[PDB]
Amino acid sequence: PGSIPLIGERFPEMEVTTDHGVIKLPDHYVSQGKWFVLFSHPADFTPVSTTEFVSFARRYEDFQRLGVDLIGLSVDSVFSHIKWKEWIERHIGVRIPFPIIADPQGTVARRLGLLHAESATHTVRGVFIVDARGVIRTMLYYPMELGRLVDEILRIVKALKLGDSLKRAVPADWPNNEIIGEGLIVPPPTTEDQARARMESGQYRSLDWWFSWDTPASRDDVEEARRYLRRAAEKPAKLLYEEA
Amino acid sequence: PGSIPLIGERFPEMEVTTDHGVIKLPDHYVSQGKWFVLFSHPADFTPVSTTEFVSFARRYEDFQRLGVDLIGLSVDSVFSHIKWKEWIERHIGVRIPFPIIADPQGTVARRLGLLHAESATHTVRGVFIVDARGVIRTMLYYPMELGRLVDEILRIVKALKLGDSLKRAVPADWPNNEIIGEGLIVPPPTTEDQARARMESGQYRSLDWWFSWDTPASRDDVEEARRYLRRAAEKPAKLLYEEA
Amino acid sequence: PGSIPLIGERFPEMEVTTDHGVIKLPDHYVSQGKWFVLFSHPADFTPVSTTEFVSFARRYEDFQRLGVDLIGLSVDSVFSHIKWKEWIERHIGVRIPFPIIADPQGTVARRLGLLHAESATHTVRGVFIVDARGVIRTMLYYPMELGRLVDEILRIVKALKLGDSLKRAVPADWPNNEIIGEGLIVPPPTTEDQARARMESGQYRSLDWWFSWDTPASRDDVEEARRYLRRAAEKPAKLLYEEA
Amino acid sequence: PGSIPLIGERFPEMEVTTDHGVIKLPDHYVSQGKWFVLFSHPADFTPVSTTEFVSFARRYEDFQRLGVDLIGLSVDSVFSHIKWKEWIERHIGVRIPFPIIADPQGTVARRLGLLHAESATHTVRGVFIVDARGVIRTMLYYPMELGRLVDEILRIVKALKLGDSLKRAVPADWPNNEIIGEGLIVPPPTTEDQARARMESGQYRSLDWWFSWDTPASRDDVEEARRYLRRAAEKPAKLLYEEA
Amino acid sequence: PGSIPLIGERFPEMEVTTDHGVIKLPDHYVSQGKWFVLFSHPADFTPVSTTEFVSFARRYEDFQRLGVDLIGLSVDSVFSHIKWKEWIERHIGVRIPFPIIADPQGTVARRLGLLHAESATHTVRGVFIVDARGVIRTMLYYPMELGRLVDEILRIVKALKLGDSLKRAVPADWPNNEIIGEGLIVPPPTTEDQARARMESGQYRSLDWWFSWDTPASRDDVEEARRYLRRAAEKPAKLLYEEA
Amino acid sequence: PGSIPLIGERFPEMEVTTDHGVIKLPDHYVSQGKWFVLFSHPADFTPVSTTEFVSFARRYEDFQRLGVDLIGLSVDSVFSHIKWKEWIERHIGVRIPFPIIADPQGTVARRLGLLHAESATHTVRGVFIVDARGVIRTMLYYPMELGRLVDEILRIVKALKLGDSLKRAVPADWPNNEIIGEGLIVPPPTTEDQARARMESGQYRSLDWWFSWDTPASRDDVEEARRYLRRAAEKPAKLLYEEA
Amino acid sequence: PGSIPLIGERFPEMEVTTDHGVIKLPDHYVSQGKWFVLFSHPADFTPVSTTEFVSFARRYEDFQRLGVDLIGLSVDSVFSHIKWKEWIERHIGVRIPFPIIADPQGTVARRLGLLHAESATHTVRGVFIVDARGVIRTMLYYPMELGRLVDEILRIVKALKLGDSLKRAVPADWPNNEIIGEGLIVPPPTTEDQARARMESGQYRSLDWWFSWDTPASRDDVEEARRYLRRAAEKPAKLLYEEA
Amino acid sequence: PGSIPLIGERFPEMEVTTDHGVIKLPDHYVSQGKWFVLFSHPADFTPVSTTEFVSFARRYEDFQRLGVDLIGLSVDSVFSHIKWKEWIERHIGVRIPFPIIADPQGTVARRLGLLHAESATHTVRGVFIVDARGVIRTMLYYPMELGRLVDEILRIVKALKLGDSLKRAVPADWPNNEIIGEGLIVPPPTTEDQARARMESGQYRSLDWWFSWDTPASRDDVEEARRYLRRAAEKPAKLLYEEA
């Protein structure tokens, strides 16, 4: 087994070397009021990893609009990072705008539990979603053989920001939940008095005292979330390998 | 932080009490040649949890067609599991067909790293995708306030089964990858002799010796994966709260 | 196997989550000048546990008369506690007025020694009788298969309060002791001088210098205690399962 | 705090000196098919203790008819035990027929967790109810100042033996339960299939799938248990101190 | 083996419960200006122990004449102590005037090394002779099967007080020593200059520079010591069993 | 404090150097069917020690008649032992017939607990009475300033041998006990059935079921023990210094 | 092996009991500006040891004229020391003027590493030569079977004092060294510059830069040292055993 | 503050590198039936050390006559040993015939305790006298500033060999002892029987039972030992620095 940071913990304090320079996590992004998604890949010049870097780069403006910065990680050196990003820009025609952590002794990898049994030497495809207070909100661990669905990372951050600002919980498959649609859930009562007051208020649609909801998300917020999933579901019009 | 089992490890050997009786993991599923998805939720009679059970139940036949069984997990007793499943069938009209582990002292939760900093007493929304050899393939940790995207769990399993059977890696956002579309990736060469053989062979479309792909998935395999994402993306026609 | 708190010790300081909110023990009750009876049960929606909750609720006014508050405990969540108390009120017609502690990781159970060999996961039927100074006065440990005799819990508190106010020890089976009836015992001399002064004072009825008693309890206090045992011994006039 | 043996554990193996000779617990009783009640008291020639010995002696044939032996315990020596028992027979006219363990260094007291905070040197009024397999079934801890209700100890053993024999759980305040009277509880279903089958069966009176009961106890078993409580509730016509 | 306090150490600081009350040793006796003899016996209501309590009681005035207080010790409780002393006074006609320590968990016994291999649970027949400064002067350990010679304890105290008051050592069998009779010994020189001064002096009777003596004890001091031995050697005029 | 060997323990196995040669304890004496008295003294050429050696030597035939050998012990060398014994024979006219252990590093002294706080470097006047099984039966610790009463050591051995042979315990001050005289005590019953058999038998004089005695010792055995005490009590006819 | 003090270390601080009284080492001698020779012998009343004490005593004035005090040591008591020194003065006609340490528990012996494998309990024949600063300058360890050559101890102290005063090293067999006779050695150069300056100066007789000497000792100092060696070499004119 | 091997212990088993080759101690010499003298010096090319090597070399035939081999030791390498020996032969005209141990890491120095406080880096002038059984018989520790008296080493070996062959102890200053001259001491009696057997037999000259001697050494053995001391005491006829 191995050790990982946990949801609701502060992201571990660390100085990291990137191909943009040395930065302190999470302070670099907390300072700017930004969320960040830290994601790892096994090695530079690997093909699944390349497809994921191009996916993130294509969604860069969507991440930026949520106040989310992106930061990559692998055990490769900064020189490899710069050569690999140059290769992607020259051969796929896509600039990778975000920094990649160089972690050659796996110091960061070990701290974040990114070395699994699949490889003794390369990180799996981990994802840490970290809010502007530097708190870990979600963690995903995809394996070497499977690329991420990057639109689900956008949907997670959009839904978490909506929940934080509207004081709501977010149903399964939001904004297309089969029970309440684009509805958001009122956190359930935790006392007998809160439960009776909830039933007696009539202020929310409810199935029981513990299951109440309303529709407080803006049309634009729901449409932005729906766009991420529509993009995930769409057969591409053009394939980038066809351009060059 | 907290300890977790790891991708490529055998799922920890354990006897668990469910609302279907006592079973041994992973043996119960290994014996049937089935994959399983073990997922956790904080407490019975909680609303996001309820929406996720209904989503899984709706997708049950999709999981069964892949040869994937489902098993849930809460700190609640089997008596609460049975009363909550009865509630969902009576009030939402959806039978939950799969078992739920009862884990009152968090014995199972501690072994799977399901107790994070967000709650001292309730599991987060963990997902363990386990193959027919009992090997952990993917792990997701969603928080209390955010329901899962269950169609991404179907995509993961379908894509891992396709990678396993065709000996291919799966690009970002498959089957809608922006570079190669529904193409699957040939694992890169790891030696100079292999790199030269790849580049002289003419066998595969390639961008470089380390980035080769082909289109070995069937129309039916690709359409099955695209249907999961199209479902995720569709505004529901009818809401189940409307016929509660 | 199993540490427990002990008679004569202050009840261990703890913050507990109930279906009435968070309360500090024993301070919540000490601050009010109230005794409390903390009792546990294995799981909500279990039948022996339901019979005991109804027994305590039916005796609620007798506990109130003695200045005693009641507080339950099980490993189930507050959501299951609220749904189970709702079920009792709806199907048995008896409102459960007192709080239940939610103890899902057995944090409280472990501190009170309520996890025995009979179940790894569920508390036995423990009783802690705690006075208005926060001192543990009596502890009972009943098993899963046997309900408690709630009238003996009332007799204990009543006798302990009488002992405390009158400076007396209480004989077996009080107030129907076969030697001294409703008599209360003078704590025995612990010195030769004390023993002779006792034997010469003719102040008490005696069988020996170590066995003196008088009858200082009011007829009301005696009959109140006897009423608890008379109720325990009576066949119910009508069974609540009929008028349900 | 302090350590105790637990319900469902074998009574700790030990050789003990009594005023009947040296015996091995729990073997001495297991080998006869007998339950035993081991109870403690602080010291010989103390008045509450004497009332409890007389109460147990008065109920000796009731225990014997149930197949239950009695054994006492204090830190006094065997010579004091024999003198104290002689005193009770001569001054109260009640022979104490059962053995008392002599525990002068408190070896047994520490093993059984009978030294609480009320006294560093003398056991509280502990009770261990041990079945014929040598398993602890119930534990009570009464304090120095309060005599036990010996009829509740008979009710417990009677109710556990009925529950063992009939494969039933025993409601609160049996045989005068306010919901089901002398009814005994069918252990609840622990699976969905068991819950449905119970509800379809028509075999038992039910309030829900988890709350079924029948009336399988013999009229004699019910009348005996009611007789113990009637005796607890009734004022003796004659006090033994008057015929001293 | 076992640990003991040693000759020339202050008696261990200790609060003890006796049948006269709670007292601090050795402080209680140091404050009275008194030596004490602490002696132990295995258990109350034992025959050799009873003979020794009667022997000490008969010599009480001889201990008072030397400024010595007596204090007994066994593992029995204070109630047993008072009953046993009551038995001795009623059946043998001798009042026991001095206190007995009750030591039920062997706290005092373990500190004084009075638990030997002959019994795991009862003290042997230890004697600690403690002077008016609280210092241990002599220790005797008799076994269960052999009563002490109480006149030798009187001889030890008398001789130690004579040695202290006269700066003399006391020969074997004093005051009937076969070499020097009632003579007392001058502490030997420890330096060549002291040895020369001693041989040049003519002050004492001498067999060598290391063996000098004189007769500084009063005739009263000598004859009092001789009387203890003469009593030890005399056939009793009348046996107390005869006048029972 | 310091550790000591204990009554009922085998005398610790040790090879010792004496002025008679090297021997093993307790084997040397056990092999001959002998008891032994090991006694210690602070140093050779000290006057109280010299008086004790002469007293033991005067009694040596009394020890031999009992099957008891003597063995001394001090931290001085064998050369000092031989010179000192020669001095005693030449100046006092008494041959010391028994061996003395030489213990210069205090190996033996530390094993027997003979270094007390009175002296860091010299043994106190310890006495170990060891039976022919090699078992310690009594231990005495006299201080530097006070010679032993050697007749009490003969009385101990004689009484222990009589009690062992006759299966009797020995009263205080035997054979002049004030209650029973030259009576010996029947060990007390330890069970209710033995106590009844004793008080139904009529076979012994008794004060109670726990205090029975008879007179099984021979007139010669009683007269021999009284002779030791009469010798202790009588002023010697002639002092050895008067021809020294 | 065993631990010893080392040349160049301060003699260990210790209070010791001698036949002259208690003294602190090395302070007692350091205080007077005196060297001391501490020497040990196995035991008093041993013959090689007696010859050595007579040898030291014969040389006492030679040590006093160098400002060297003598102090002996054995595991015997001070009483044996005084009796043995008396024996020497009376039988040999030689007074032993210097103190002997009494070390009965071997505390000092163990501190100076004087217990070797030849004897578990008696010190070998050690010699500690200690200067007026309290520093150990030379250590000799002679065995039980071989007396020391006391004139070599004089030679060592005379040679060390001359070396210290004149800032010289002392050749083998000084003052009869076969290379330089009564010559004293100039400490060699330890640097290249020092070695060249030594050879360029022509201040001393030299065999090489590392081997220079001169003759700075007075005729009196040289004759004093040769006299010690002459005495060692010459058969005494008269043997002390004769004039007994 | 340093460990050394001890008299009567076997010389520590070790392989050492010498300027004659690798040899095992003490086996190399034991195998030949030879004693050896192992001696230490601080460093090669030091002047006191050179005087000692020349002294040993001049006495080499005397050591050979006694069956004693010589072995030196310093922390310098074998190359420095050979150059230094070459220097002594060329500049002093004396061949060093015996080996020197090279001990550059102080491995041998540390085993033999030859590193004292005078130097962290160089051995003091240690001497180990080792018999033909490999047993350490004597140890000398001379300091850096003082050469040894080699004739005393010859006298020790000659005297130990005489003692071993004649079963005698050797008096102080032998063969010029002031009491007994060239007499040798009979080991003292260690038992009373031996002491009486010695004083009855009149086979030896005696001052007491513990001081007997005879003259068993041949005149050759006595005069050979006296010759060593006479050589120590003589001014050299010719100083070696003269011719050099």
Chains B and C touch (3+ CB pairs under 8 A): yes
Q: Is F60 on the interface with D (CB under 8 A)?
A: no
**Could you give the C-alpha distances from D14 to C42, D21, D105, G68, in angstroms and in order?**
31, 14, 14, 72
**Three-class SS of residue B156?**
helix
Pairing status of strand C68-74 against strand F35-39: unpaired
Nearest to G55 by CA among G5, G17, G87, G96: G96
Cβ-defined contact of A191 to C85 (cutoff 8 Å) = no
Do B10 and B135 touch, CB atoms closer than 8 A? yes
The C-alpha atoms of residue C133 and residue G155 are separated, in whole angstroms, by 86
Do H185 and G47 touch, CB atoms closer than 8 A? yes
The DSSP secondary-structure symbol of B136 reads E
Chains G and A touch (3+ CB pairs under 8 A): no
DSSP bridge pairs for B16: B23
Indicate if C127 and C200 belong to the same structural domain: no
Q: Is E76 on the interface with C (CB under 8 A)?
A: no
Phi first, then psi, for residue B64 (nearest 5°) are: -65, -40
Q: Is E91 on the interface with D (CB under 8 A)?
A: no
Do H143 and G128 touch, CB atoms closer than 8 A? no
Mutation choice for E interface testing from F13, F116, F145 by most E CBs within 10 A: F145
The C-alpha atoms of residue E52 and residue E96 are separated, in whole angstroms, by 11
Indicate if C104 and C3 belong to the same structural domain: yes
Phi first, then psi, for residue B85 (nearest 5°) are: -60, -40
Domain boundary pick from F91, F118, F145: F145
Q: Say if residue H26 is preceded by a cis peptide, omega within 30 of 0.
A: yes
Chains C and F touch (3+ CB pairs under 8 A): no
Query: Which residues lie below 8 Å from residue G87, measured CB to CB, with a gap of 6+?
Result: G45, H208
CB contacts of E83 in chain C (<8 Å) are 210
Cβ-defined contact of E234 to F176 (cutoff 8 Å) = yes
Do C131 and C137 touch, CB atoms closer than 8 A? yes
Tokens of B122: 């309730």
In this complex, which chains have at least 3 CB pairs below 8 Å with chain H? Answer: F, G
Indicate if B163 and B122 belong to the same structural domain: no
Name the residue in chain F with its Cα closest to that of G46: F79
Tokens of C61: 């006014």
CB contacts of E138 in chain F (<8 Å) are 141-143, 146
DSSP bridge pairs for B177: B181
Domain boundary pick from A95, A113, A145: A145
Burial class (CB in 10 A: 0-12, 13-18, 19+), A123: buried
The C-alpha atoms of residue G185 and residue E102 are separated, in whole angstroms, by 81
Indicate if H135 and H154 belong to the same structural domain: no
Mutation choice for E interface testing from C185, C190, C193, C196 by most E CBs within 10 A: C190
Mutation choice for B interface testing from C19, C75, C144 by most B CBs within 10 A: C75
The C-alpha atoms of residue D177 and residue D165 are separated, in whole angstroms, by 20
Indicate if G11 and G125 belong to the same structural domain: yes
Helices B47-58 and B78-91: crossing angle in degrees, nearest 10, is: 70
How many alpha carbons lie under 13 Å from residue F34 in its C-beta half-sphere?
A: 18
Tokens of E205: 């009777």
Q: What CATH number is attached to the domain comprising A11?
A: 3.40.30.10
DSSP letters, F46-74, are: -HHHHHHHHHHHHTHHHHHHTTEEEEEEE
Cβ-defined contact of D21 to F188 (cutoff 8 Å) = no
Cβ-defined contact of E78 to C191 (cutoff 8 Å) = yes
Phi first, then psi, for residue A77 (nearest 5°) are: -75, 165
DSSP letters, B35-102, are: EEEEE--S-SS-HHHHHHHHHHHHTHHHHHHTTEEEEEEESS-HHHHHHHHHHHHHHT-----S-EEE
Q: Say if residue B171 is preceded by a cis peptide, omega within 30 of 0.
A: no
The C-alpha atoms of residue E15 and residue E77 are separated, in whole angstroms, by 15
> To which residue do tokens 């007692």 refer?
G28
Indicate if B136 and B15 belong to the same structural domain: yes
**Three-class SS of residue D89?**
helix
The residue type of E206 is: S
Q: Note down the domain range covering G58.
A: 1-145
**Could you give the C-alpha distances from G167 to A107, E76, F237, G185, G214, in angstroms and in order?**
62, 80, 76, 9, 11
Number of domains present in the structure of chain C? 2
CB contacts < 8 A, F to H, total 23
Q: Is G119 on the interface with F (CB under 8 A)?
A: no
Do H5 and H111 touch, CB atoms closer than 8 A? yes
Q: Is G80 on the interface with F (CB under 8 A)?
A: yes
Do E75 and D105 touch, CB atoms closer than 8 A? yes
Nearest to B227 by CA among B2, B20, B61: B61
Do F110 and F117 touch, CB atoms closer than 8 A? no
E-state strands within chain D: 2-3, 14-18, 21-25, 35-39, 68-74, 100-102, 125-130, 136-142, 184-186, 205-208, 211-214
Q: Is D46 on the interface with E (CB under 8 A)?
A: yes
Indicate if E118 and E155 belong to the same structural domain: no
The C-alpha atoms of residue B46 and residue B124 are separated, in whole angstroms, by 13
Q: What CATH number is attached to the domain comprising D190?
A: 3.30.1020.10
Nearest to C176 by CA among D153, D144, D239: D239
Indicate if C4 and C105 belong to the same structural domain: yes
The C-alpha atoms of residue E145 and residue F168 are separated, in whole angstroms, by 8
Q: Say if residue C104 is preceded by a cis peptide, omega within 30 of 0.
A: no
Mutation choice for G interface testing from E192, E207, E208 by most G CBs within 10 A: E192
Q: Is F87 on the interface with H (CB under 8 A)?
A: no
Kind and range of the H or E run holding H142: strand H136-142
Indicate if D102 and D219 belong to the same structural domain: no
**Three-class SS of residue A17?**
strand
Domain boundary pick from A95, A118, A145: A145
Query: Which residues lie below 8 Å from residue F56, measured CB to CB, with a gap of 6+?
Result: F39, F63, F70, F72, F96, F98, F150
Nearest to H43 by CA among H2, H87, H102, H118: H102
Q: Is H188 on the interface with F (CB under 8 A)?
A: yes
How many alpha carbons lie under 13 Å from residue B176 in its C-beta half-sphere?
A: 23
The C-alpha atoms of residue H53 and residue H39 are separated, in whole angstroms, by 10
Indicate if H115 and H157 belong to the same structural domain: no
Chains D and G touch (3+ CB pairs under 8 A): no
CB contacts of E233 in chain F (<8 Å) are 176, 226, 229-230, 232-233
**Three-class SS of residue H112?**
coil
Helical ranges in chain B per DSSP H? 27-30, 47-58, 60-65, 78-91, 107-112, 150-166, 192-200, 219-233
Do B144 and A122 touch, CB atoms closer than 8 A? no
Phi first, then psi, for residue G145 (nearest 5°) are: -85, 0
Q: Residue D9, Cβ neighbours under 10 Å: how many?
A: 16
Nearest to D89 by CA among D46, D54, D60, D42: D54
The C-alpha atoms of residue A179 and residue D44 are separated, in whole angstroms, by 71
DSSP letters, chain C, are: --EE--TTSBPPPEEEEETTEEEEETHHHHTTT-EEEEE--S-SS-HHHHHHHHHHHHTHHHHHHTTEEEEEEESS-HHHHHHHHHHHHHHH-----S-EEE-TT-HHHHHHT---TT-SSS--EEEEEE-TTSBEEEEEEE-TTB---HHHHHHHHHHHHHHHHHT-BB-TTTTSBTTTBT-EEEPPP-SHHHHHHHHHH--SEEEETTEEEE--S-HHHHHHHHHHHHHHHSPPSS-TTTT-
Do G152 and G158 touch, CB atoms closer than 8 A? no
H/E/C letters for each residue in E113-153? CCCCCCCCCCCCEEEEEECCCCEEEEEEEECCCECCCHHHH
Do H44 and H153 touch, CB atoms closer than 8 A? no
Tokens of D167: 């494969």
Kind and range of the H or E run holding G141: strand G136-142
Torsion of the alpha carbons at D97, D98, D104 and D109, rounded to the nearest 10: -150
Chains H and F touch (3+ CB pairs under 8 A): yes
**Three-class SS of residue E37?**
strand
Name the residue in chain A with its Cα closest to that of B7: A116
CB contacts of F163 in chain E (<8 Å) are 145-146
Indicate if E116 and E153 belong to the same structural domain: no
In angstroms, the separation between the Cα of residue G20 and the nearest Cα of chain H is 24
> To which residue do tokens 């049950």 refer?
B60
**Three-class SS of residue G151?**
helix
Q: Residue G90, Cβ neighbours under 10 Å: how many?
A: 8
Q: What share of chain H is helix, strand, coil (3-state, %, to 5)?
A: 35, 25, 40
The C-alpha atoms of residue B183 and residue B185 are separated, in whole angstroms, by 7
Cβ-defined contact of F171 to E147 (cutoff 8 Å) = yes
The C-alpha atoms of residue A33 and residue F45 are separated, in whole angstroms, by 94
Pairing status of strand E68-74 against strand E100-102: parallel
Mutation choice for D interface testing from B17, B76, B79, B96 by most D CBs within 10 A: B79
CB contacts of G20 in chain E (<8 Å) are 191-193
Do D184 and D168 touch, CB atoms closer than 8 A? yes
CB-based burial, F146-170: b 16+ in 10 Å, e otherwise: bbbbbbbbbbbbbbbbbbeebebbb
Helices first, then strands: H and E counts in chain G: 8, 11
Cβ-defined contact of H210 to F79 (cutoff 8 Å) = yes
The DSSP secondary-structure symbol of F89 reads H
Query: Which residues lie below 8 Å from residue F172, measured CB to CB, with a gap of 6+?
Result: E48, E51, E52, E54, E55, E147, E148, E149, E150, F178
Indicate if E179 and E195 belong to the same structural domain: yes
Q: Where is chain F broken, named by the residue before each break, C–N > 2.5 Å?
A: none
CB contacts of F198 in chain E (<8 Å) are none
E-state strands within F27-134: 35-39, 68-74, 100-102, 125-130
